[PDB]
């Protein structure tokens, strides 16, 4: 599908993060390949605050998700991220910082140079704490509260990589494989 | 422009599989709803039996039906280098040592395709029979092209548990997507240049 | 639990298999550790033929299993093994041979000496085919039919190692951890 | 007489955990049904945070609360040597490099124990607060015993995603059983002598 359009944006955005383009080329590729998931799930969890139900990717509603056999995980996205995001009114800047934090993930297997990934991460949350403390001084604990959604996004990210999750569509895989099979293409040979 | 390109390969394999199915005797005589059942239930194992036997000509890799010849790689999560390892130890290394021929492989695949356990089947017993005819023929064939090897038939059948195990990890880890997807994604990624 | 009584029988039985005790000591330990599962599931699948519903381990009935949240896998044991076992009237000798075949599993990781595991396996099915052909001559395909339940037992064996399978008992883990917590043991210190 | 012996160790740890919980302030003031929820939801991660920080004194292994010091082993399936590897790379190697103290570990554990996401909770917000008090104190503590390290607090919090990932594989692979069970089972097995 045109889910590489979604893959274009993502890459275009990492490239604009400070210092990401200065990492060894293969490290960048690992980082993106390891984060793309958490990165999307966060992007469309926050975008969803805007509406008042469901996930705004073209706009998913609870009954579909639950009917499509993926209720449990949809409820988790909404309870554990969207709502938490809405209550505390995370702003676009904070989401942007968290996502950067996620990209600069040092425990990613295969990294040629993790110390700097840590180093870059430190740089990003230091600054996020600066932001939080200027912009919302009456909430001393906000910056931790931000970071503490990362385990939630982590376990949710892992749950959207299950094969049953992707086979979300039973009566179209038969329609694919059904059509392929009524093709009378070989009913001639001479 | 990478993703849509991967969907294409997904379409091509699995068009190829379905062609293979149809050229199997009696497979097309079953109700259309059963054909879909057998295929959805079997797709992974029938692909692994292939890329495995194909990857015989290779040393220490997997040959993807399309020239690209793949390997265990550094950033591969525990699970995908693990499947890689099993594929070589339990399927490719064993197929090689016993010099399993393409007739012999065709049979095993056909026996997998006719899976009477497959949930939903309208007539499970008539798949048992098609399964049974296939192995009967496989047996006769072995005792004829390799009569000095009295236990080869069973030895062929006993790659099937492994294949089950392995078929399962691949449907768990999405090994198949990773396979056709890896180069395309790594390569587009060098759009940071 | 006294599921080591079950673990005593199992080991006592491998020891009596021909040639198993002649394998390097650590190989035997691998074989048992890799097969114990398929070995039990087969033993109590065949024992179940005897009754006319459910699993006779102290005798499990379908409603319990389905209520206990483990219906799907219980239905599989019954459809894919017990019933198939009953229809074809597998006998104790054939079960015994299949199980031996399962024990002598050559693709078990860590084996110091797999060639002989293959070798021993060959010896067992050769003989099982002898049996089958003497004892049931009018069924030429029986011996394959036997072996072809091994993928079923394999995938079923794998399904009984899932953690959710073992946590089959919700309202007793709370009773355990609940009791542990009303212990007023430390309400004294001087 | 091995199995019943493993059940014993299961009982001992998880009695030990529950003792730890109760000595946490306010934890016992919550309704009894919530205490059970927090504990069932958290047990794996709270154990991994422990055996990890304990395994600091070790090089390349895991120290099980009871002297027995364990390693990656040949017959270990992909998954269990994999968890082993992660535990050392993402938790033990990192805890070591930053010299995380037992006060600092206690806090992280307490923050895990107070998990407001935990399905079933009767009052989720009053766990948010107990979570919040804990980290507030953790913060103050870091800025005091290590003031030259302005980013340590967060750096502590960011071991938590890893711990989540790893907690999960251990509940998947039954890593915990394997740990206390392995010697006992291998050892009884030498009853073939």
mmCIF file of C-alpha atoms in Angstrom, chain A:
data_model
loop_
_atom_site.group_PDB
_atom_site.id
_atom_site.type_symbol
_atom_site.label_atom_id
_atom_site.label_comp_id
_atom_site.label_asym_id
_atom_site.label_seq_id
_atom_site.Cartn_x
_atom_site.Cartn_y
_atom_site.Cartn_z
ATOM 1 C CA UNK A 1 0.000 0.000 0.000
ATOM 2 C CA UNK A 2 0.701 3.721 0.087
ATOM 3 C CA UNK A 3 1.979 3.146 3.649
ATOM 4 C CA UNK A 4 5.355 4.173 2.256
ATOM 5 C CA UNK A 5 3.968 7.667 2.026
ATOM 6 C CA UNK A 6 3.749 7.167 5.844
ATOM 7 C CA UNK A 7 7.271 5.803 5.599
ATOM 8 C CA UNK A 8 8.441 8.856 3.660
ATOM 9 C CA UNK A 9 7.186 11.344 6.302
ATOM 10 C CA UNK A 10 8.811 9.287 9.094
ATOM 11 C CA UNK A 11 12.242 9.291 7.471
ATOM 12 C CA UNK A 12 11.942 12.934 6.400
ATOM 13 C CA UNK A 13 11.329 13.731 10.081
ATOM 14 C CA UNK A 14 14.255 11.794 11.567
ATOM 15 C CA UNK A 15 16.553 13.489 9.060
ATOM 16 C CA UNK A 16 15.453 16.854 10.593
ATOM 17 C CA UNK A 17 16.169 15.745 14.206
ATOM 18 C CA UNK A 18 19.383 17.280 15.354
ATOM 19 C CA UNK A 19 22.362 15.165 14.928
ATOM 20 C CA UNK A 20 20.623 12.107 13.569
ATOM 21 C CA UNK A 21 22.155 12.527 10.175
ATOM 22 C CA UNK A 22 25.623 12.549 11.813
ATOM 23 C CA UNK A 23 25.265 8.955 13.092
ATOM 24 C CA UNK A 24 26.932 6.227 11.007
ATOM 25 C CA UNK A 25 24.575 5.488 8.109
ATOM 26 C CA UNK A 26 23.768 1.916 9.225
ATOM 27 C CA UNK A 27 22.958 3.088 12.801
ATOM 28 C CA UNK A 28 20.299 5.406 11.480
ATOM 29 C CA UNK A 29 18.765 2.517 9.587
ATOM 30 C CA UNK A 30 18.679 0.400 12.749
ATOM 31 C CA UNK A 31 17.166 3.227 14.765
ATOM 32 C CA UNK A 32 14.394 3.821 12.249
ATOM 33 C CA UNK A 33 13.735 0.051 11.817
ATOM 34 C CA UNK A 34 13.438 -0.383 15.590
ATOM 35 C CA UNK A 35 11.381 2.711 16.288
ATOM 36 C CA UNK A 36 9.033 3.011 13.305
ATOM 37 C CA UNK A 37 6.401 1.191 15.308
ATOM 38 C CA UNK A 38 6.372 3.092 18.611
ATOM 39 C CA UNK A 39 6.848 6.195 16.461
ATOM 40 C CA UNK A 40 3.614 5.771 14.518
ATOM 41 C CA UNK A 41 1.560 4.537 17.520
ATOM 42 C CA UNK A 42 2.563 7.659 19.383
ATOM 43 C CA UNK A 43 1.967 9.987 16.423
ATOM 44 C CA UNK A 44 -1.610 8.755 15.934
ATOM 45 C CA UNK A 45 -2.309 8.449 19.688
ATOM 46 C CA UNK A 46 -1.665 12.113 20.161
ATOM 47 C CA UNK A 47 -3.521 13.087 16.957
ATOM 48 C CA UNK A 48 -6.496 11.279 18.472
ATOM 49 C CA UNK A 49 -6.724 13.656 21.478
ATOM 50 C CA UNK A 50 -8.215 16.038 18.952
ATOM 51 C CA UNK A 51 -11.308 13.905 18.366
ATOM 52 C CA UNK A 52 -13.471 12.514 21.191
ATOM 53 C CA UNK A 53 -13.557 8.817 20.319
ATOM 54 C CA UNK A 54 -11.382 6.241 18.616
ATOM 55 C CA UNK A 55 -8.227 6.537 16.554
ATOM 56 C CA UNK A 56 -7.715 9.219 13.887
ATOM 57 C CA UNK A 57 -5.039 7.803 11.603
ATOM 58 C CA UNK A 58 -9.080 7.665 8.104
ATOM 59 C CA UNK A 59 -10.725 7.630 11.584
ATOM 60 C CA UNK A 60 -11.337 4.300 13.384
ATOM 61 C CA UNK A 61 -14.321 3.829 15.690
ATOM 62 C CA UNK A 62 -14.568 1.395 18.651
ATOM 63 C CA UNK A 63 -17.263 -0.887 17.240
ATOM 64 C CA UNK A 64 -15.279 -1.625 14.099
ATOM 65 C CA UNK A 65 -12.100 -2.353 16.064
ATOM 66 C CA UNK A 66 -13.920 -4.613 18.527
ATOM 67 C CA UNK A 67 -15.836 -6.298 15.685
ATOM 68 C CA UNK A 68 -12.608 -6.725 13.661
ATOM 69 C CA UNK A 69 -11.327 -8.844 16.588
ATOM 70 C CA UNK A 70 -8.854 -6.165 17.766
ATOM 71 C CA UNK A 71 -10.773 -4.603 20.673
ATOM 72 C CA UNK A 72 -8.387 -5.405 23.506
ATOM 73 C CA UNK A 73 -5.473 -3.577 21.880
ATOM 74 C CA UNK A 74 -7.654 -0.687 20.666
ATOM 75 C CA UNK A 75 -8.907 -0.221 24.256
ATOM 76 C CA UNK A 76 -5.252 -0.197 25.380
ATOM 77 C CA UNK A 77 -4.253 2.523 22.884
ATOM 78 C CA UNK A 78 -7.171 4.638 24.116
ATOM 79 C CA UNK A 79 -6.802 3.991 27.862
ATOM 80 C CA UNK A 80 -3.016 3.904 28.137
ATOM 81 C CA UNK A 81 -2.043 6.555 25.628
ATOM 82 C CA UNK A 82 -4.817 8.687 24.058
ATOM 83 C CA UNK A 83 -6.629 9.414 27.275
ATOM 84 C CA UNK A 84 -3.476 9.931 29.301
ATOM 85 C CA UNK A 85 -2.298 12.195 26.560
ATOM 86 C CA UNK A 86 -5.568 14.181 26.666
ATOM 87 C CA UNK A 87 -5.956 14.576 30.486
ATOM 88 C CA UNK A 88 -2.472 16.031 30.953
ATOM 89 C CA UNK A 89 -2.803 17.905 27.639
ATOM 90 C CA UNK A 90 0.525 16.749 26.240
ATOM 91 C CA UNK A 91 1.460 19.329 23.595
ATOM 92 C CA UNK A 92 2.955 18.754 20.143
ATOM 93 C CA UNK A 93 6.410 19.756 21.448
ATOM 94 C CA UNK A 94 6.351 17.145 24.187
ATOM 95 C CA UNK A 95 5.174 14.421 21.791
ATOM 96 C CA UNK A 96 7.955 15.489 19.413
ATOM 97 C CA UNK A 97 10.488 15.142 22.242
ATOM 98 C CA UNK A 98 9.238 11.809 23.450
ATOM 99 C CA UNK A 99 9.388 10.496 19.887
ATOM 100 C CA UNK A 100 12.954 11.721 19.505
ATOM 101 C CA UNK A 101 13.743 9.980 22.775
ATOM 102 C CA UNK A 102 12.266 6.824 21.316
ATOM 103 C CA UNK A 103 14.351 7.096 18.114
ATOM 104 C CA UNK A 104 17.535 7.567 20.011
ATOM 105 C CA UNK A 105 17.195 4.069 21.492
ATOM 106 C CA UNK A 106 20.559 2.743 22.709
ATOM 107 C CA UNK A 107 19.622 -0.885 23.383
ATOM 108 C CA UNK A 108 18.880 -1.478 19.743
ATOM 109 C CA UNK A 109 20.746 -4.580 18.610
ATOM 110 C CA UNK A 110 23.457 -4.004 15.977
ATOM 111 C CA UNK A 111 24.345 -0.431 16.846
ATOM 112 C CA UNK A 112 27.910 0.336 15.799
ATOM 113 C CA UNK A 113 28.064 3.161 18.335
ATOM 114 C CA UNK A 114 25.566 3.156 21.267
ATOM 115 C CA UNK A 115 27.392 5.539 23.609
ATOM 116 C CA UNK A 116 26.416 8.435 21.311
ATOM 117 C CA UNK A 117 22.847 7.234 21.034
ATOM 118 C CA UNK A 118 22.664 7.527 24.825
ATOM 119 C CA UNK A 119 24.462 10.899 24.508
ATOM 120 C CA UNK A 120 21.894 12.187 21.995
ATOM 121 C CA UNK A 121 18.958 10.916 24.077
ATOM 122 C CA UNK A 122 20.369 12.742 27.155
ATOM 123 C CA UNK A 123 20.523 15.936 25.102
ATOM 124 C CA UNK A 124 16.777 15.570 24.132
ATOM 125 C CA UNK A 125 15.278 14.879 27.562
ATOM 126 C CA UNK A 126 17.459 17.475 29.251
ATOM 127 C CA UNK A 127 15.867 19.949 26.863
ATOM 128 C CA UNK A 128 12.364 18.463 27.326
ATOM 129 C CA UNK A 129 12.758 18.967 31.057
ATOM 130 C CA UNK A 130 13.747 22.567 30.316
ATOM 131 C CA UNK A 131 10.627 23.008 28.245
ATOM 132 C CA UNK A 132 8.315 21.369 30.808
ATOM 133 C CA UNK A 133 9.755 23.510 33.609
ATOM 134 C CA UNK A 134 9.433 26.812 31.754
ATOM 135 C CA UNK A 135 6.067 26.097 30.135
ATOM 136 C CA UNK A 136 4.319 24.316 33.033
ATOM 137 C CA UNK A 137 6.052 25.372 36.323
ATOM 138 C CA UNK A 138 3.084 24.571 38.530
ATOM 139 C CA UNK A 139 3.394 20.887 37.548
ATOM 140 C CA UNK A 140 6.805 19.872 38.912
ATOM 141 C CA UNK A 141 6.333 16.136 38.082
ATOM 142 C CA UNK A 142 5.146 16.469 34.467
ATOM 143 C CA UNK A 143 8.479 15.523 32.871
ATOM 144 C CA UNK A 144 8.676 12.185 34.605
ATOM 145 C CA UNK A 145 4.942 11.655 33.838
ATOM 146 C CA UNK A 146 5.863 12.023 30.153
ATOM 147 C CA UNK A 147 8.661 9.460 30.224
ATOM 148 C CA UNK A 148 6.500 7.029 32.174
ATOM 149 C CA UNK A 149 4.264 6.508 29.195
ATOM 150 C CA UNK A 150 7.195 4.913 27.409
ATOM 151 C CA UNK A 151 6.684 1.437 28.977
ATOM 152 C CA UNK A 152 3.048 1.685 27.940
ATOM 153 C CA UNK A 153 3.958 2.600 24.368
ATOM 154 C CA UNK A 154 6.589 -0.112 24.428
ATOM 155 C CA UNK A 155 4.273 -2.913 25.387
ATOM 156 C CA UNK A 156 1.581 -1.527 23.020
ATOM 157 C CA UNK A 157 4.150 -1.276 20.173
ATOM 158 C CA UNK A 158 4.951 -4.954 20.776
ATOM 159 C CA UNK A 159 1.328 -5.901 20.638
ATOM 160 C CA UNK A 160 0.867 -4.353 17.167
ATOM 161 C CA UNK A 161 3.525 -6.659 15.730
ATOM 162 C CA UNK A 162 1.586 -9.882 16.359
ATOM 163 C CA UNK A 163 0.603 -11.726 13.138
ATOM 164 C CA UNK A 164 -3.050 -12.063 14.297
ATOM 165 C CA UNK A 165 -3.139 -8.267 14.581
ATOM 166 C CA UNK A 166 -2.246 -7.926 10.851
ATOM 167 C CA UNK A 167 -4.634 -10.679 9.760
ATOM 168 C CA UNK A 168 -7.385 -8.376 10.933
ATOM 169 C CA UNK A 169 -9.381 -9.141 7.748
ATOM 170 C CA UNK A 170 -10.816 -12.725 7.372
ATOM 171 C CA UNK A 171 -13.384 -12.298 4.513
ATOM 172 C CA UNK A 172 -10.935 -10.652 2.074
ATOM 173 C CA UNK A 173 -8.098 -13.111 2.310
ATOM 174 C CA UNK A 174 -10.622 -15.686 1.061
ATOM 175 C CA UNK A 175 -11.776 -13.179 -1.554
ATOM 176 C CA UNK A 176 -8.107 -12.709 -2.645
ATOM 177 C CA UNK A 177 -7.304 -16.429 -2.719
ATOM 178 C CA UNK A 178 -10.782 -17.211 -4.077
ATOM 179 C CA UNK A 179 -10.342 -14.934 -7.101
ATOM 180 C CA UNK A 180 -6.846 -16.259 -7.806
ATOM 181 C CA UNK A 181 -8.431 -19.716 -8.058
ATOM 182 C CA UNK A 182 -11.329 -19.132 -10.432
ATOM 183 C CA UNK A 183 -8.842 -17.662 -12.868
ATOM 184 C CA UNK A 184 -9.393 -20.135 -15.700
ATOM 185 C CA UNK A 185 -6.051 -19.037 -17.275
ATOM 186 C CA UNK A 186 -4.586 -22.507 -17.859
ATOM 187 C CA UNK A 187 -7.751 -24.121 -19.336
ATOM 188 C CA UNK A 188 -5.886 -23.873 -22.664
ATOM 189 C CA UNK A 189 -2.572 -25.448 -23.789
ATOM 190 C CA UNK A 190 -1.434 -26.349 -27.336
#
